[PDB]
Amino acid sequence: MKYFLDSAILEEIRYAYENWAIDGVTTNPRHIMNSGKPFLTVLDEFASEFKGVENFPISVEINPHLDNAKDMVEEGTKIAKLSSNFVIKIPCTEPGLIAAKEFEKQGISTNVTLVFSPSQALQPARIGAKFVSPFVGWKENSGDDTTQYIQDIVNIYKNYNYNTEIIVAALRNGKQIVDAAKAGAHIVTCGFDVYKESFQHAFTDYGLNKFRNAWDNTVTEA
Amino acid sequence: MKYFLDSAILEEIRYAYENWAIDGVTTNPRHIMNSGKPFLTVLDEFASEFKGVENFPISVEINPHLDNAKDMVEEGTKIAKLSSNFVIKIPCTEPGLIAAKEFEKQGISTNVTLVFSPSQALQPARIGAKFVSPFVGWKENSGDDTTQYIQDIVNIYKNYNYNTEIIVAALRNGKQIVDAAKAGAHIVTCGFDVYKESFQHAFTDYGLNKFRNAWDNTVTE
Amino acid sequence: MKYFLDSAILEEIRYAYENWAIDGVTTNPRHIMNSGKPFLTVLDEFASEFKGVENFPISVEINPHLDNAKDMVEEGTKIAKLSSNFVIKIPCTEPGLIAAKEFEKQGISTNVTLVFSPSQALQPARIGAKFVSPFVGWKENSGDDTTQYIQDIVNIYKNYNYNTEIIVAALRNGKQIVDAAKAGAHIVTCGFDVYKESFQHAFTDYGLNKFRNAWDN
Amino acid sequence: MKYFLDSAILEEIRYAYENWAIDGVTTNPRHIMNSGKPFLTVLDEFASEFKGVENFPISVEINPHLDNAKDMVEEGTKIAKLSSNFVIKIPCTEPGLIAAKEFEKQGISTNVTLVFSPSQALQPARIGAKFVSPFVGWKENSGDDTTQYIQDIVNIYKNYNYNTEIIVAALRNGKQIVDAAKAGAHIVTCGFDVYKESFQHAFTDYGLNKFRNAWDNT
Amino acid sequence: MKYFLDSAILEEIRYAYENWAIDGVTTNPRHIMNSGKPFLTVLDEFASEFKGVENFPISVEINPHLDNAKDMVEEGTKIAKLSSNFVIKIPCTEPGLIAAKEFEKQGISTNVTLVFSPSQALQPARIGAKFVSPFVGWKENSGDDTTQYIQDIVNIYKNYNYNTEIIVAALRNGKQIVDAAKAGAHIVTCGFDVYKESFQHAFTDYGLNKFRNAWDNTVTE
Amino acid sequence: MKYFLDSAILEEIRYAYENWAIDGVTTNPRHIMNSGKPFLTVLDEFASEFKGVENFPISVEINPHLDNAKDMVEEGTKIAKLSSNFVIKIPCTEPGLIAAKEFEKQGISTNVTLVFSPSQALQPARIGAKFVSPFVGWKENSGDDTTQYIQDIVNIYKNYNYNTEIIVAALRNGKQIVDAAKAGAHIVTCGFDVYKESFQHAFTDYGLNKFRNAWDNTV
Amino acid sequence: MKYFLDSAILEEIRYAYENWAIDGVTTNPRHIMNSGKPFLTVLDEFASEFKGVENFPISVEINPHLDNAKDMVEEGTKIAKLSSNFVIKIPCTEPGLIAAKEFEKQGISTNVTLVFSPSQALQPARIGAKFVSPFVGWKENSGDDTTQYIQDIVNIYKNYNYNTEIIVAALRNGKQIVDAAKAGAHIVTCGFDVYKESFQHAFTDYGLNKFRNAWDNTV
Amino acid sequence: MKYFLDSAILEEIRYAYENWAIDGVTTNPRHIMNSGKPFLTVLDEFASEFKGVENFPISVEINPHLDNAKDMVEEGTKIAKLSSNFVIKIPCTEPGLIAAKEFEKQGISTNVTLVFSPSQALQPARIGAKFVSPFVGWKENSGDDTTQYIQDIVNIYKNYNYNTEIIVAALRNGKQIVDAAKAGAHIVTCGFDVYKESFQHAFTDYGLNKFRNAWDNT
Amino acid sequence: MKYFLDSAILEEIRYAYENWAIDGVTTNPRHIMNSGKPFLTVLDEFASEFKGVENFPISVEINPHLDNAKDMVEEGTKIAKLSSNFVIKIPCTEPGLIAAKEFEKQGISTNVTLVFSPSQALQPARIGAKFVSPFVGWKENSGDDTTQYIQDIVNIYKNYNYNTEIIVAALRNGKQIVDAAKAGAHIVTCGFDVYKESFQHAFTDYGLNKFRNAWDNT
């Protein structure tokens, strides 16, 4: 089971890789923006940072204004050249899908994003996308429940033996990671702080204090 | 998992194949009618369109008036000759089944249609039909629930290791496609618009707009 | 349990009332458009058609461009004057809700529409809307399942004793009507043909033929 | 997999085999009676009709008056000689079981019938019966529910890897066939009319009419 | 069913009351801090803002350092005097509970907070607290599931006919509000933006645009 | 709804009453023993401690050697005289039940204990016992599951409108209290420490510390 | 909830009434036989034993050979005269039902027995029988499962507000009593030994011994 | 899959083997007592009765007074010598388990009995007992439900791939056998009469009569 | 399947190994304290006691004050040297995990403890810990239910084919052991008395007494 970091902050990515054994990285125009840096600079820093590393995907989203497959494929190919770690994040639209279909035919890995239902998830798999990214958070913000549709996607993918790997996305806490693990999603992608806190629990603190007292009442060096 | 187009409009079929990777095509006398064109011309256009393609079924339904296996087999064989992509759509009637039994014995692939229950679905499988097409929409229109009977058919087929492939039919939206995928149906057949919209979701639009704004506030070169 | 007609075609509405005992009517800018007639003409025809009847709601949607409660309330009040059967259909937006809150305070019945989740459904009830209209069809078209969220709304409303009545909307077949009946929704709203076919069943035809033979013997 | 015809009417059996691909036949003193013809004549007609067809069982029930295993085995052996397609239908009684145990030891296939519970179904399997026939209809007539006990039998058989094949019996409609298919029963046995109608549905008729109109407009 | 605002920002509280018909307000030392203002100033502004209004609770948390019921009761009484809308937020500790017991005996309403299990929720109810506040968010952050324990609390309270009202707390989205509504919780408390967004949905936007197009093709006036 | 203290330590009982609003007390020969005091002294201290208090049952178990109803009733009546708060704890045995039947006829409240199944729970209710005490802990120690049998008892009592109140007993933690609350048991009885800790949770500590930091940056 | 004794042994009935507060008695030709006495003697002993008692049914089964309603009604009326406690146990047959229908019209209480399915249970209720007795044990002996059909009967009776009271019959252990209590059956009928043992549990014995030790270490 | 006879009456055991294909035998001090014969005589008769037969376990319970593993192992070894069909029934006590552990190390098959919970069942499996015998009847007599704990044991054994075979014990009817079959218990052990009746059903009688009438109308 | 003893009392460990076939040992600073002996003496006694035994893990917890991976790894390596049976118990903290990651890279087995949720359990598995120890008791003391989160962990581990073995910890009775067995947890760790009593049941005692009477009458 794979943990990807949904961030564009290189220092977050460095720490995660070294200490958490993150299995890859996801970005989008919003995360790129909040990096403070320009797009091609972020990309360049990434290229260099992971020149060596062999099976470590970095999902990078093409200009969202694009409204036609031809242009989509052009701009994405440019980005692909920049590093073999890069995967092309692409919206689940009529052109988006057509473009992904082509990208994958040409052996360029894609990540279809802005998926919100199992029917939306099906087509990426049917065109042999390397990654599909179904969203939780935005739906929940509006009062929609997500647990069924995510489970459905996983079951469907397993049932029809599709290779496409599911990245559960827009996650905001540990419980949600667990939901996905229970569902059997291939991958999960979360902000730095989400993962950090998913490791920490008040009972651990409580436990340490119990044990510190006990140690302080033991002869610890005969 | 297989997506078939339930349409007779060649332009719809062309787009679907090129962009959606549809895995085949279903027709019926109503879709043939609404094509505007005559039957054997539709068939001819299809024959030529897919002369090349090897594993791409086109289900073509024999005249609904025919009321006897002998005639059914005659008329269907004629249609089969016209192209090796064609499969013979045949109603789930007493003669219909007998005809399919024979067609398949003679190595002509059939698609038993107008199936509405699992008991109706069983016999096609027992005769080694290549396809069975159970219906959702028409039942739902009259207030019947379909989800159990479809699931039952799939489970039955899997359980007794039949080769017959299930084409869930008379679908009208994405949710229903998903229901079938969850059930494990082999195939689904839908109109052009159904599939098109099954790929589109309001949250995607919402997402794009978020992202367009973000891009417009980033230095992209 | 109430059946409303989601149409703006007066002839459909006439037949429904006379033969199906429809309990009211829903409209929206799309149905108004497809009437062929202009808005205030449709409204006028309705006003006259039901001048007498006092217990028969007709939901009529204000201009969707409006982006402010003040204007919303103005335009809707105008429409309310035209007939006491009219209910003011209003989108579930921040201004939409504020407007409904006011309309209802002033004793003008509202129908909050374009509701797609239970959290969206809650606020209309909290503001004392006469009707809330959660949608099925558009969600299903995009692959979303609706059965839970509709059931949830009903349970929530019953549980907290809100008087707001649920109109399950964007329906397309009989099964879906039944889903709502099973859920306990107050109201359902459907096109003419949906209802017509929800009454008809192939086994009935089959049965008649059995019985015709028996009679003729 | 596995439709048997519960009839003694040879014309029904002929049609079924040729057109429905029935996988075998079950009979019973009641069906034999209502054939009109006498037992050994019915059997003879069957012997000739098939013998030579390889794996097509015809279940034929020994005299129900018999009350001792010794006699049961004698009379059944006689019937077995008449054709190797015949299987010996035998009631689930204390002697019945003892007889089946012996029949199967001697390589004569049996069908233990008048089974109404899973405990009754177990012993036939434990003695290596070729067929067990649990009943639905008669129980339902008296208000008993059957769906659990049938499911239980199937699960039990699968779970303990018994070769004995289940013939769900005393069926009266298509829904019930489906119940058994869902349960995973090996075999089902039904009257001619049951099967015939299990293939027909009012929506098909309705559909044909839609389609006839459409055809007439091209 | 009651919506409370979990904020100390007066402008948020004003808007909510006027437009959302919020039924009350919750605060805690963290929200007080992030107000920018000092505690007794925030309190004073509140007192004045709602001088008139009856049945509108404002939950205000006593100093968390306090480790003894005697002091707790002293400091809280002081706060209670400041306004009859105020409710005394109190941690679920051994002294916390003892203090609440006394406060309620003296007819001063309390809100027991930092409740994380049904056993913790029981004692406040057993002491006749006006409010108990069980937490969702912090638990979920550490990987704990909350839906059962919240449901349990509600069922328990209903089953033993306690008047104590449940305020589901540390909420972050609309789905979670719905979970609580389904559970039958009396009250929910959320930040401004949570509520705002719980009213908005991408399908509404999509719907408006459909309808705007339709209107633009209609002769209205 | 009701919390009883399963202890014979007076100081524990005092604190519980004053701070936790315990609704009553349960004892048994084991708790009496571990009090350190003699039986009739414990009882006397209780009598005096709660002379006033009107709705506060104290369950006190008769000698477990007794094997006949006649003697059981004699010894228990003696104990009942000592205080009107006292309830007579009695094992779920053939004589035990017969004795309870009589005690209740004579208007002396009983608590049938050492109940381990719903069939055992039924008869106390059928004889109009004031309390029945089904056990959790000892069963679980041997690997038996208890959740169904407790739920069953509650449902049965509610369904047939028995007055007898259920005291879930031999409890060891908060989760178990909650199980009983979910089941709808009338009463629960727990050791001092169980209740104390059932009120405390590591997330509360964590919360306080968050808030202490916030307070220290305010005002 | 009612416990009836399924016995014809008067000494069993005496003990049960005095100590267990049994709410009535059921009999059948097999129990009558194993009494050692003749039918009319058993009946006479019962009549006298409960001359006083007003609300205490004794179910007494007419000759099973009878094959016609007219005779059934005659013989049962004779038995009814003998005591107002008696209820007429009657098989669930075509004549059986017709007879019960008449008996009840004439205000003579009946108990329809040898009921094995809910459809069989329905008709007694539809004719206003005072008691219906569905059977568990004999079905289970042959491998049939009973839990559904009993639950179904209860739900059906409650749902359509029939007065007829359900006596779950041919019971053989405590678990089965509990099953019926869970189902909400009105009445249960069991042998002496069944009830006796339904009140005992090994953990109680274990508990007593723990407590005896504790008592022996207390002043 | 396996039916064992819980009896010490040799005539019952003979009939069962010959006609029911019983797969083995269980005994205990109570059944030995009710045989009428003395212990070592019963054992001797058994030894001789099955000298030949290869795979047919006979469970024989050591003196229940024993309170120590040393003695348990001594007395059981003595019994084992008497016949290789014998399995040593042993109570689920602290000494009981220790003894079984040793018996099995020494290649002597044991049957741990008086098991009433899954935790009790686990340790026998953990020490490689050939048989564990969980009880139904005595629990039910006191109002305890058994179906969960039995299912749990089976699932646990399957899940952790233990070889120990489960003998569901203290059974009294057919339904209970079925419960165990549904659960997937390896073995069941019942009195003669229980099994006998588990094969018979009122609907079979009813069926025979229908069929006798039909036969009588040739 | 695997029973570990959560104790530091050598005599308890000896008895358990010899009679219960315990599969290993867990300790923590509290158990070390309540041993009465000093830490490095306890460790030494263990080292010697199990010098031979090859597949027998002994979990030993490093100083809980440590607040950095570097120091953690240093102190743990020291302990590892002392015996190849020892596993390094480590709290589920940010440094704790980083340290475990390193320990395991260096081929030193770790046991991540003070795990209270599935998200906490995931990371140890993701870093290839040999053992994770999720806690039941302390949660239940505060009124939290644990059954789901334990089941979730097991299902998650199985589903993503992690080798890390789950030690359900802070158990206090037999029922809880069974819960874990039902869940499919790899390992369980319990105090001496818990296991002892998990083998004893009042019905066994009751059974013995029945049987003693019966034996005394032959």
Coordinates of C-alpha atoms in Angstrom, one line a residue, chain H:
Chain H
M1 CA -18.2 -35.7 7.3
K2 CA -17.7 -37.9 10.5
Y3 CA -20.4 -39.4 12.7
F4 CA -19.2 -40.8 16.0
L5 CA -21.4 -42.8 18.4
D6 CA -21.5 -41.5 22.0
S7 CA -22.4 -44.8 23.6
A8 CA -20.7 -47.7 25.5
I9 CA -23.3 -50.3 24.4
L10 CA -21.5 -52.7 22.1
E11 CA -24.7 -53.8 20.3
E12 CA -25.4 -50.1 19.5
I13 CA -21.8 -49.8 18.2
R14 CA -22.1 -53.0 16.1
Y15 CA -25.4 -51.9 14.4
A16 CA -24.1 -48.4 13.8
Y17 CA -20.9 -49.6 12.1
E18 CA -22.6 -52.1 9.9
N19 CA -25.6 -50.0 8.8
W20 CA -24.7 -46.3 9.4
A21 CA -21.0 -46.4 8.6
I22 CA -20.2 -44.6 11.8
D23 CA -16.6 -43.4 11.7
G24 CA -15.7 -44.0 15.3
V25 CA -16.9 -44.0 19.0
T26 CA -16.9 -41.8 22.1
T27 CA -17.3 -42.9 25.7
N28 CA -17.1 -41.3 29.2
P29 CA -17.4 -42.6 32.8
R30 CA -21.2 -42.1 32.7
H31 CA -21.7 -44.1 29.6
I32 CA -19.3 -46.8 30.9
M33 CA -21.4 -46.9 34.1
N34 CA -24.7 -47.2 32.2
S35 CA -23.3 -50.1 30.2
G36 CA -23.8 -52.3 33.2
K37 CA -20.4 -53.9 32.7
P38 CA -17.1 -53.0 34.5
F39 CA -14.6 -50.6 32.8
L40 CA -11.8 -53.0 31.9
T41 CA -14.3 -55.6 30.6
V42 CA -16.0 -53.0 28.3
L43 CA -12.5 -52.0 27.1
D44 CA -11.5 -55.6 26.5
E45 CA -14.7 -56.3 24.5
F46 CA -13.9 -53.3 22.4
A47 CA -10.2 -54.2 21.9
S48 CA -11.3 -57.6 20.5
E49 CA -14.3 -56.2 18.5
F50 CA -12.0 -53.9 16.5
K51 CA -8.6 -55.7 16.6
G52 CA -8.6 -55.8 12.8
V53 CA -10.1 -52.4 11.9
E54 CA -7.5 -49.8 11.0
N55 CA -8.9 -46.2 11.1
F56 CA -11.7 -46.2 13.7
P57 CA -11.1 -44.2 16.9
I58 CA -12.6 -45.2 20.3
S59 CA -12.4 -42.4 22.9
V60 CA -12.0 -43.7 26.4
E61 CA -11.8 -41.4 29.4
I62 CA -9.3 -41.9 32.2
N63 CA -10.2 -41.8 35.9
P64 CA -11.7 -38.3 36.6
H65 CA -10.4 -38.3 40.2
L66 CA -6.8 -37.9 38.9
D67 CA -5.4 -34.4 39.8
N68 CA -1.9 -34.5 38.4
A69 CA -0.3 -34.9 34.9
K70 CA 2.1 -37.6 36.1
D71 CA -0.6 -40.1 37.1
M72 CA -2.9 -39.1 34.1
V73 CA -0.1 -40.1 31.7
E74 CA 0.6 -43.3 33.5
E75 CA -3.0 -44.5 33.6
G76 CA -3.7 -43.5 30.0
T77 CA -0.6 -45.2 28.6
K78 CA -1.9 -48.4 30.2
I79 CA -5.2 -48.0 28.3
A80 CA -3.4 -47.1 25.1
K81 CA -1.4 -50.4 25.2
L82 CA -4.7 -52.3 25.3
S83 CA -5.6 -51.3 21.7
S84 CA -4.3 -48.9 19.0
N85 CA -7.9 -47.8 18.2
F86 CA -8.2 -46.2 21.7
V87 CA -7.9 -42.5 22.1
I88 CA -7.4 -41.0 25.6
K89 CA -10.3 -38.7 26.6
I90 CA -8.9 -36.1 29.1
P91 CA -10.7 -33.1 30.8
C92 CA -9.8 -29.5 29.9
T93 CA -7.9 -28.8 33.2
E94 CA -4.4 -27.4 33.9
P95 CA -3.1 -31.0 34.5
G96 CA -5.4 -32.4 31.8
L97 CA -3.7 -30.2 29.1
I98 CA -0.2 -30.8 30.4
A99 CA -0.9 -34.5 30.2
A100 CA -2.3 -34.3 26.6
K101 CA 0.8 -32.2 25.6
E102 CA 3.0 -35.2 26.7
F103 CA 0.7 -37.9 25.4
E104 CA 0.9 -36.4 21.9
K105 CA 4.6 -35.8 22.1
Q106 CA 4.9 -39.5 22.8
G107 CA 2.6 -40.1 19.7
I108 CA -0.5 -41.2 21.8
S109 CA -3.7 -39.6 20.5
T110 CA -5.8 -37.7 22.9
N111 CA -9.3 -36.2 23.0
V112 CA -9.6 -33.1 25.2
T113 CA -13.2 -33.1 26.6
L114 CA -15.3 -30.8 28.8
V115 CA -14.5 -27.8 26.6
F116 CA -17.2 -25.0 26.9
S117 CA -15.6 -22.0 25.2
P118 CA -13.2 -21.1 22.3
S119 CA -10.4 -20.1 24.6
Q120 CA -10.6 -23.6 26.2
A121 CA -10.6 -25.1 22.7
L122 CA -7.5 -23.1 21.6
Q123 CA -5.0 -24.7 24.0
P124 CA -5.7 -28.3 22.9
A125 CA -5.1 -27.3 19.3
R126 CA -1.9 -25.4 20.4
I127 CA -0.6 -28.6 22.0
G128 CA -1.5 -30.7 18.9
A129 CA -4.4 -32.8 20.3
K130 CA -5.9 -35.2 17.8
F131 CA -9.4 -34.3 19.1
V132 CA -11.2 -31.6 21.0
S133 CA -14.8 -32.1 22.2
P134 CA -16.8 -28.9 22.8
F135 CA -20.2 -29.3 24.5
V136 CA -23.6 -28.0 23.5
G137 CA -26.3 -29.7 25.6
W138 CA -25.3 -28.9 29.2
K139 CA -24.8 -25.2 28.3
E140 CA -28.3 -25.1 26.7
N141 CA -29.9 -26.8 29.7
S142 CA -28.8 -23.8 31.8
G143 CA -30.0 -21.3 29.2
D144 CA -26.6 -20.5 27.4
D145 CA -26.5 -20.2 23.6
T146 CA -23.9 -22.3 21.9
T147 CA -24.1 -21.6 18.2
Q148 CA -21.7 -18.7 18.2
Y149 CA -19.0 -20.4 20.3
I150 CA -19.0 -23.5 18.1
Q151 CA -18.9 -21.5 14.9
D152 CA -16.1 -19.4 16.4
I153 CA -14.0 -22.6 17.2
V154 CA -14.4 -23.9 13.7
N155 CA -13.5 -20.6 12.0
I156 CA -10.5 -20.3 14.4
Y157 CA -9.2 -23.8 13.7
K158 CA -9.6 -23.3 9.9
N159 CA -8.1 -19.8 10.0
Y160 CA -4.9 -20.9 11.9
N161 CA -4.6 -24.3 10.1
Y162 CA -4.8 -26.5 13.2
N163 CA -5.0 -30.3 12.5
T164 CA -7.1 -30.9 15.6
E165 CA -10.5 -32.2 14.8
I166 CA -13.6 -30.8 16.5
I167 CA -16.1 -33.3 18.0
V168 CA -19.4 -31.4 18.7
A169 CA -20.7 -33.2 21.8
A170 CA -23.7 -33.5 24.1
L171 CA -26.1 -33.5 21.2
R172 CA -29.8 -34.4 21.5
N173 CA -31.4 -33.9 18.0
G174 CA -31.0 -33.6 14.2
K175 CA -31.3 -29.8 14.1
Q176 CA -28.1 -29.6 16.3
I177 CA -26.2 -32.0 13.9
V178 CA -27.2 -29.7 11.1
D179 CA -26.0 -26.6 13.0
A180 CA -22.6 -28.3 13.3
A181 CA -22.6 -29.3 9.6
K182 CA -23.4 -25.7 8.7
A183 CA -20.6 -24.5 11.0
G184 CA -18.2 -27.0 9.3
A185 CA -17.3 -29.0 12.4
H186 CA -15.1 -32.0 11.5
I187 CA -17.0 -34.5 13.7
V188 CA -20.3 -34.9 15.6
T189 CA -21.0 -37.4 18.4
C190 CA -24.5 -38.5 19.2
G191 CA -26.5 -41.3 21.0
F192 CA -27.9 -44.1 19.0
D193 CA -31.5 -42.8 19.1
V194 CA -30.5 -39.3 18.0
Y195 CA -29.0 -40.5 14.7
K196 CA -31.8 -43.0 14.2
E197 CA -34.4 -40.3 14.4
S198 CA -32.3 -37.8 12.4
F199 CA -33.0 -40.1 9.4
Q200 CA -36.8 -40.2 9.8
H201 CA -39.3 -37.5 9.0
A202 CA -43.1 -37.3 9.1
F203 CA -43.2 -36.1 5.5
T204 CA -41.5 -39.3 4.4
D205 CA -44.3 -41.3 6.0
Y206 CA -46.9 -39.0 4.4
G207 CA -45.1 -39.4 1.1
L208 CA -45.1 -43.2 1.2
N209 CA -48.8 -43.3 1.8
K210 CA -49.5 -41.0 -1.2
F211 CA -47.3 -43.2 -3.3
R212 CA -48.7 -46.5 -2.0
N213 CA -52.2 -45.3 -3.1
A214 CA -50.7 -44.4 -6.6
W215 CA -49.0 -47.8 -6.9
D216 CA -52.2 -49.6 -6.0
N217 CA -53.7 -47.9 -9.1
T218 CA -51.6 -49.8 -11.8

